[PDB]
Design an enzyme around this catalytic site. Sequence first.
Site, PDB file in Angstrom:
ATOM      1  N   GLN F  17      -7.183  -4.487   5.440  1.00  0.00           N
ATOM      2  CA  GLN F  17      -6.796  -5.625   6.259  1.00  0.00           C
ATOM      3  C   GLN F  17      -5.284  -5.677   6.457  1.00  0.00           C
ATOM      4  O   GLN F  17      -4.510  -5.177   5.639  1.00  0.00           O
ATOM      5  CB  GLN F  17      -7.259  -6.935   5.629  1.00  0.00           C
ATOM      6  CG  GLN F  17      -8.665  -6.933   5.094  1.00  0.00           C
ATOM      7  CD  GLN F  17      -9.045  -8.271   4.487  1.00  0.00           C
ATOM      8  OE1 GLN F  17      -8.981  -9.300   5.151  1.00  0.00           O
ATOM      9  NE2 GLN F  17      -9.430  -8.260   3.216  1.00  0.00           N
ATOM     10  N   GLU F  18      -4.874  -6.296   7.566  1.00  0.00           N
ATOM     11  CA  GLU F  18      -3.463  -6.499   7.907  1.00  0.00           C
ATOM     12  C   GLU F  18      -2.709  -5.172   7.944  1.00  0.00           C
ATOM     13  O   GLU F  18      -1.667  -5.008   7.310  1.00  0.00           O
ATOM     14  CB  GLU F  18      -2.789  -7.482   6.950  1.00  0.00           C
ATOM     15  CG  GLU F  18      -3.581  -8.744   6.707  1.00  0.00           C
ATOM     16  CD  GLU F  18      -2.711  -9.916   6.322  1.00  0.00           C
ATOM     17  OE1 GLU F  18      -1.478  -9.816   6.480  1.00  0.00           O
ATOM     18  OE2 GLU F  18      -3.265 -10.945   5.875  1.00  0.00           O
ATOM     19  N   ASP F  19      -3.257  -4.222   8.695  1.00  0.00           N
ATOM     20  CA  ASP F  19      -2.691  -2.889   8.874  1.00  0.00           C
ATOM     21  C   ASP F  19      -2.673  -2.082   7.579  1.00  0.00           C
ATOM     22  O   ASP F  19      -1.860  -1.173   7.429  1.00  0.00           O
ATOM     23  CB  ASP F  19      -1.284  -2.952   9.473  1.00  0.00           C
ATOM     24  CG  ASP F  19      -1.294  -3.345  10.938  1.00  0.00           C
ATOM     25  OD1 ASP F  19      -2.237  -2.954  11.657  1.00  0.00           O
ATOM     26  OD2 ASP F  19      -0.356  -4.050  11.364  1.00  0.00           O
ATOM     27  N   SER F  20      -3.546  -2.397   6.632  1.00  0.00           N
ATOM     28  CA  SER F  20      -3.867  -1.439   5.588  1.00  0.00           C
ATOM     29  C   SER F  20      -4.956  -0.510   6.110  1.00  0.00           C
ATOM     30  O   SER F  20      -5.484  -0.685   7.212  1.00  0.00           O
ATOM     31  CB  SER F  20      -4.301  -2.136   4.303  1.00  0.00           C
ATOM     32  OG  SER F  20      -3.181  -2.589   3.566  1.00  0.00           O
TER      33      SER F  20
END
Lengths: 236, 66, 97, 429, 111, 144, 48, 48
Positions: F17-20
């Site tokens: 999530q969140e550009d992971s």
Amino acid sequence: GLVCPAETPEGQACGLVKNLSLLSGISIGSPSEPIINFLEEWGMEPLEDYDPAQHTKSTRIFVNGVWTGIHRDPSMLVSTMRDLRRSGAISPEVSIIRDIREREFKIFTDVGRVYRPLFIVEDDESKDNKGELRITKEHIRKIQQGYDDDVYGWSSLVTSGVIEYVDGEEEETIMIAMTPEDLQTRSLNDTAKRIKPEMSTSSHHTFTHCEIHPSMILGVAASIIPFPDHNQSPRN
Amino acid sequence: MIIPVRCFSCGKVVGDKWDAYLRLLEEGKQEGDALDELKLKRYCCRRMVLTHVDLIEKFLRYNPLE
Amino acid sequence: IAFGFADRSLPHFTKDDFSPESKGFVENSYLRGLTPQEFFFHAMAGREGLIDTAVKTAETGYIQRRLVKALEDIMVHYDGTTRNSLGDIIQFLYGED
Amino acid sequence: DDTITTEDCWTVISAFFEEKGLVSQQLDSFDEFMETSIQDLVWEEPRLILDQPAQHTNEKDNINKRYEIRFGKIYLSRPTMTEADGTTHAMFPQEARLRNLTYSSPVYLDMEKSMFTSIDGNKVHIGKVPIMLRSKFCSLRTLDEVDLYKMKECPYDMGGYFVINGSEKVLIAQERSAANIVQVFKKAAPSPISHVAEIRSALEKGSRLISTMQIKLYGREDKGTGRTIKATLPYVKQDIPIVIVFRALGVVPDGEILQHICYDENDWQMLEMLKPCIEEGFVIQDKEVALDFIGRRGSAALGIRREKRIQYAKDILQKELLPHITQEEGFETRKTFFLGYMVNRLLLCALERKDQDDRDHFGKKRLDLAGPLLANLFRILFRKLTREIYRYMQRCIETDRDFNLNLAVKSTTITSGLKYSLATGNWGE
Amino acid sequence: SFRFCLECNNMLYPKEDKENQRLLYSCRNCDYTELAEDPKVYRHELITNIGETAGIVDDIGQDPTLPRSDKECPECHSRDCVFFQSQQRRKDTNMTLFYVCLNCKKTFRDE
Amino acid sequence: AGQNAIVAIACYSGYNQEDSMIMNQSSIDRGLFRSLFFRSYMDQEKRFGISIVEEFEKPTRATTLRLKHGTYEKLDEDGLIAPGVRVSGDDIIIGKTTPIPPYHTKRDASTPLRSTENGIVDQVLLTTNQEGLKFVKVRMRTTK
Amino acid sequence: DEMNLHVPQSEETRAELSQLCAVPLQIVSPQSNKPVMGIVQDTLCGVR
Amino acid sequence: TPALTVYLDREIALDIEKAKVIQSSIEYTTLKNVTSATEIYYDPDPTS
RNA sequence: GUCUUGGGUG
Ligand SMILES: [Zn+2]
Ligand SMILES: [Zn+2]
Ligand SMILES: [Zn+2]
């Protein structure tokens, strides 16, 4: 066509540091003596023979920003200058810029001008070859061969009058077709292929040039992107 | 550089197929048919061989330094 | 989209063409794909956004620094008042409630 | 014949890239520099002159004595390497990269010293110029792919950069407004000036800035009652009215000034905007008095008498006033005509009959690549060198000896300057 | 429209012949004084239209960027004319057009 | 300058999530997105006078002072480490001594490895500079 | 993104951190008298 | 952008003609605002 | 161990 619309640094250099488009080229500079000689031969009148009481219709001729004379009839002068440039007699990187509302004719041989190549649509309104590319399949056959049938590369195309260079100032005066198909109006209905723009306002188009390919406006870094026309520009 | 021994995704051995693939491409077979004959059926294994760029040929041109 | 060229936005249009396509209306979707003209106009708009983000943050940070320096010495005291470092009253009761 | 397809376009584009590549602008700029620019900069100021006529505690015997050198051809050799032994040999970019050397060519300038006395010299090494890799003077230009491999060079390496102290350096193209073009700008609310026509001037030979000259329109909308137009000559502190400079250039009758300004007598708004200028410069009626009025402001020393105050002002009006037009005398009419054109463009922008000029228009900009940048830097450094030659011939000639000029040129000036600029990026001394 | 001197080639300024009460024109350099035709001496305008039709040349038909319309030429019934809007550049100017025929080079309008 | 990875778009376990982004460990083990790294250190000898110069040499403790806190046991007799030797942070790769102006008359000017980096010496170059003084370049190698 | 971590070097600063700056104590903000931390990204979509 | 918000008296505030008359009373016009073009004529005799 | 310049990251 001159600098990449997508490649620019983030931050304080945004928009100040630019990147050349793939087909961009920088002028080397050129002597102005042949330009002046051609102008003097073909009918330009000097400023030691200037009298604005009479010359109410004359067009003033600038060479590298220097006013050098006036002419009675810019039409044949621009036609002859463009034919000389497309025949190789004049350096191909020389701007030939007619202004019509301002009654001016500006020729530039400056160094450092950015320019880009275009196809030349035949625009002389006197032959069946009007309104179509002068480049044909014989030229492509020669380019693949590598020689003319009594080295054939890019410069031979430029000197045969099928491609010419235009800088930003000359681009003001030209009418560029976006794709070679745009040269003719089609009679479709594909819900999948993108709607090529209507362009309904203008009754009859008089094209003078065609883009070789629209993707050439991008630079080195933007050219890696696959389908950049399906992205919002900040991501590119 | 040089063909990887295994397929990254699944681990099939592709390092013994590069020469056969080049010979198949020489005799005219198109890339999909050559990959079919080498029995590369999963598109991971197929893209292992289809996208390889062989740079060792370029590195070998610089003279041995000993 | 302004007439950056003489009487036109791009050199692929004719002079004094006020139609939506000439002055920056993008008729397509991202799925369908933008035309080169629409691509360039959308690039101009995105560039405007990037410039704003890059350039306004300094004015905003300066404003917040000045506000902090102006209000840094103000505290609620045990009698309820809101005073600065000179002891001067700013509010007789904080928030008036 | 058939319809040109997209694949035909990619064939043409492949022809373009087969001919030019991706860094052809750097290489072509540098080739132009090394073929023509260095010689043109050397012949820009091609002679030095010392002089002494008389009165040095002699027996009233006077002789005019000129010592003089004339710079000649430039000789350009391949990059060479000199060892601490003094042995020499060819230098290649990989060796220069490994040993932190600079990859540069020696520049020789023929000097021919002359002397004249009226009673009343070999290939001097002037410095080393760094070489752009893969250009016509690089040692990697004549090689094929095989030899390139033997010289440890990557065939994909396209060149276009320099090697200074073993570090690859690339010259970033500099963007500048064009030269010899008139641009007219609007102004701001708390400013008496409303419209300004600005032109920068430069010469076709050298492409260097010379002088700048604005022509402002004093008087705001409804405020600043005087809507006069006043020039701004270089090397003068206060702004001169326009009729004054038209008179100084040799057209006194106000009808002729207007006609140089007015192409169409029938037009009336512009002529109605031209009267306050005529009135604010009605006093003068001849060239000498106006030209003194210019001279009284030339920011020069105090108290010059009229006859040579005139010469100073006439010199300013001749050179540093539109050098692109011409810098020789007897051609003032062309400068007057250009002044009329500039005033008309000013008035067209002021009378709202034409829009103000676009600063961001890319056709009115120029890109300075390696060629012109190295031309500027080399011109600076070579004027330094020639000043050193003069400072030296001031001393050594006093000894009254023949000198071989190979101890008169400190070659390290141009070499150290080029190396400092290309290694730091700071473009200048 | 102010004239210029027939002798000194400067410009004539207004004056009054107080012994005849007729508007002369006085040379500020010479003594010449000529009779005038028009007793008007000054003008000032704010609603101007100079630059309405002036933006046309003979070879304006040669401009390939001007859009071409199908409006009928009032002169020669020509079904092909190039057109453009008012060349005046003020902010409040109209968007009304001008029409130039390629046959007679007479300019016309759609009114 | 890349690799064609097989990509799924999913909210699989919440670690992307969140550009992971979740990556396959086995594909990493088989060489996905693996790269070599080369760092080169440089050093030379200066001339502070007539007979006062620096020297590449393994500095013995007796004649030297201000010796670095790293280990010197990897240098050959010429003050240079040999290619093929593993090197850790703070280890000396170029031994150099600077003479003391007017025993125990030298200061050190040794070049350690960067305190963060590991690796293996690849190519120890030796030449002379513009002025004929000894010149050394040492290229390290590692894998990330 | 990168973030900084500061370690308190005494018991007084430890107590100050845990009793004034702790994450649970900052859930409601005085800026707009509403929460600043909410359910986000995948837990929001998944709970819907 | 300086600006006033001029609330009208209620009797005016409902009628539109009265509000427009108040508008006319409050708005600023100068001789510039209603002048087209000025001349200067020499008229030697006032009675003719 | 110091100062400037340049390329970048959030
Ligand atoms: Zn697989
Ligand atoms: Zn007179
Ligand atoms: Zn007609």
